[PDB]
Structure 1
């Protein structure tokens, strides 16, 4: 049968962390950059990556979250009587993940400074503005050799290993913190108390012409399952879904 995951942030920093995790993956979509399309896709996701670091301070809270997962993993270390080896190198994976970020360059500086990127990013604010005759540097850049762009791209993506990785760990260690408890929604409606929880990972069943519309006040969240167009396939119903509170 058909299945779909629905991640949703329960707080203001997971929102940011997921936004970025999405932005960083997009850099790597295919990566034979060849066409106008190719380059723009990249720089928009980079510029958008940059726009976040205009605010936020993504370095400090990742650090603090890594110490959290350590203090978590700490809890499990002594007893129970299963897994010691894996978890220790898993902690040492965080210690090195944590360590490397703070001493690394002011995150995003390389691409912020970059000349080719500098140009395209100011022209990403006009509709159809970033084009051939508008970005004469871009237009030639594409005409250069096939593996010249690939030498500038890798360095472009590689500059954010301090951020990419640190995050990549933290988020794996979140997504495993909560098992999938099988719920049921009355009247196409549901509430609970998230608690400390950062994320919801809502698994949706038979594709009911429905999707999770989540709201929340303080710690408590309210899921309401909306259908695709109001009077198109209206079946609010009693749903039998699966939801984990990471």
Structure 2
């Protein structure tokens, strides 16, 4: 009966969350059988390439992978903790890293693909991607299903070195911190984030509201606002759980 809100506390976590989201959307509506499925797929690809054009994700994500290995290394001597399970986890990190750096250009396969590039151009036009403006797509959707599935696989698997490394670090961020109980007065809250990239906030579906998070330096502030901007309102004592990961 709870709703989890994730909020990035730096431009790093923003990009990673956007990329994580865009990548998993590719594999959500498979297989591609119709226009809807195709346009959903290609647009997610198109939006992925646009994010990639903004800089090099490779360099940041590789620094983050190394960062996590050093943290796990701090836990070796601790009583009770098991060695061969984190060192295997460390070994998976170095593997995800070595593959990422040795990987080709990111999104280049998708960038160079004739059909995808031909759809990418027509996406910026509201009614652009119809059958008469994309006969090439229209004829592609009449092909045997097995031919499309093979193309889709090669397209998604080209993002495998990135997908791996990224999934690794986000899975290790979301496990680094526990949910601490906090309370808000009149729908307001603030704290010093510190050295965290991600806030994880559990509310309540029945609580009738959502968090609006702002930031300054390494500090954050939450103003809980009612989903209904008119019919419903914050209490003066709102209990919630928040993790600083």
Other structure's SS at 2:229 match: coil
TM norm structure 1: 0.98
Cα distance in 1 between the residues matched to 2:158 and 2:221: 40
Cα distance in 2 between the residues matched to 1:135 and 1:206: 43
Query: Is the 1:227–1:236 Cα contact (8 Å) retained in structure 2?
Result: no
Instruction: Provide the residue aligned with 1:195 in structure 2.
Output: 194
Cα distance in 2 between the residues matched to 1:95 and 1:161: 15
Query: Is the 2:123–2:129 Cα contact (8 Å) retained in structure 1?
Result: yes
TM norm structure 2: 0.98
Summarize deviations over 1:16-55 as a string: whole Å, max 9, x none. Answer: 0100000000000131101000100000000001000111
Summarize deviations over 1:55-74 as a string: whole Å, max 9, x none. Answer: 12100000000000001101
* Runs of 5+ unmatched residues, structure 1: none
Q: Greater shift after overlay, 16-25 or 224-233?
A: 224-233
Figure out how many residues of one structure are paired with residues of the other and give that number. Answer: 245
Cα distance in 2 between the residues matched to 1:201 and 1:57: 26
Other structure's SS at 1:244 match: strand
Query: Is the 1:214–1:222 Cα contact (8 Å) retained in structure 2?
Result: yes
Cα distance in 1 between the residues matched to 2:218 and 2:233: 30
Alpha-carbon RMSD: 0.9
Other structure's SS at 1:182 match: strand
Query: Is the 1:181–1:243 Cα contact (8 Å) retained in structure 2?
Result: yes
Summarize deviations over 1:176-207 as a string: whole Å, max 9, x none. Answer: 00011111111111000000100000011252
Cα distance in 2 between the residues matched to 1:235 and 1:212: 11
1:238 shift after superposition: 1.1
Instruction: Provide the residue aligned with 1:225 in structure 2.
Output: 224
